[PDB]
């Protein structure tokens, strides 16, 4: 049978994953990873979670969130808590990028700046018994091609390899816009 995710639920922000569902989160059709998305505990709260490892954006997990009334408004950032529990992580890095697909902008605008996690610097990261925590914060005020009322349609988060050996489980929680 196909991979089966936990129930999808209804798209809501902030996404907190406390109702047993993915609160509208799913794989993008073009995701390089389509493994099971389940709700798992991280740092005392339920979180969206999956496992994967990079060979060898083709190998990159790409999460997707569709919501009809998604607009930037007066928000300046998208933020989320991100946790990693590696089985292997000793070299390279991971780049996290944010994309929206406004129909008025050819179905693609990207937050200009990349959020980078450097696996050679894990012993400097916030951590509890092999669970590493990053407060991912990506500036969306800096997107000039949209206005505050532009219908964004869907948000994608891309987790791309940078010559890493990462393999393990990851967790996403508290996805929200912030001023």
Q: Which residues bind a copy of itself (CB under 8 A)?
A: 57, 91-93, 95, 97, 99, 105-108, 110, 112-114, 116, 118, 120-121, 139, 142, 144-145, 160, 162-163
Please identify which residue in 43, 130, 145, 178 interacts with Ca ion, judged by CB under 5 A: 130
Instruction: Give the one entry of Ca ion, a copy of itself, none that residue 91 binds, where binding means its C-beta sits below a cut-off of 5 to 8 angstroms depending on kind.
Output: a copy of itself
When asked if residue 81 is in the footprint of Ca ion (CB under 5 A), the reply is yes
Piece of 79-87, 121-129, 137-145, 152-160 that binds Ca ion (CB under 5 A): 79-87
Q: Dump strand ranges (E) for the chain.
A: 25-27, 38-42, 45-53, 62-66, 77-88, 93-100, 109-110, 115-118, 126-128, 131-139, 154-162, 167-178
When asked if residue 90 is in the footprint of Ca ion (CB under 5 A), the reply is no
When asked if residue 45 is in the footprint of Ca ion (CB under 5 A), the reply is yes
Identity of the residue, 30 or 41, whose beta carbon is nearer to Ca ion in the bound complex: 41
**CB 11, CB 24: distance < 8 Å:** yes
When asked if residue 40 is in the footprint of Ca ion (CB under 5 A), the reply is no
Closest CA to 50 of 170, 179, 144: 170
Piece of 9-17, 101-109, 116-124, 152-160 that binds Ca ion (CB under 5 A): 9-17
| Lateral strand order in the sheet of 45-53 | 38-42, 45-53, 167-178, 77-88, 131-139, 126-128
Closest CA to 9 of 22, 68, 171, 17: 22
Identity of the residue, 113 or 176, whose beta carbon is nearer to a copy of itself in the bound complex: 113
**CB 142, CB 117: distance < 8 Å:** no
**CB 101, CB 107: distance < 8 Å:** yes
When asked if residue 119 is in the footprint of Ca ion (CB under 5 A), the reply is no
| Residues at the contact surface with Ca ion, assessed by CB under 5 A | 16-17, 45-46, 81, 85, 130, 173
């Amino acid at each position: 049978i196909p991979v089966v995710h936990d129930p999808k639920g209804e798209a809501v922000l902030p996404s907190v994953f406390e109702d047993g569902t993915r609160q509208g989160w799913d794989w993008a059709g073009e995701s390089g990873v389509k493994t099971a998305l389940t709700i798992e505990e991280a740092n005392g709260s339920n979180a969206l979670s999956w496992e994967f490892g990079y060979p060898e954006w083709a190998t990159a997990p790409r999460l997707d969130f569709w919501k009809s009334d998604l607009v930037r408004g007066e928000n300046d950032y998208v933020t989320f808590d991100f946790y990693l529990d590696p089985v292997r992580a000793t070299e390279g890095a991971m780049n996290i990028n944010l994309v929206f697909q406004p129909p008025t902008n050819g179905y693609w605008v990207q937050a200009p700046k990349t959020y980078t996690i450097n696996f050679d610097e894990l012993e400097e990261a916030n951590q509890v018994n092999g669970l590493y925590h990053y407060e991912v914060k990506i500036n969306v005020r800096d997107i000039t091609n949209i206005q505050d009322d532009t219908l964004l349609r869907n948000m994608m988060i891309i987790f791309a390899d940078v010559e890493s050996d990462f393999a393990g489980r990851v967790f996403v929680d508290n996805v929200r816009f912030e001023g």
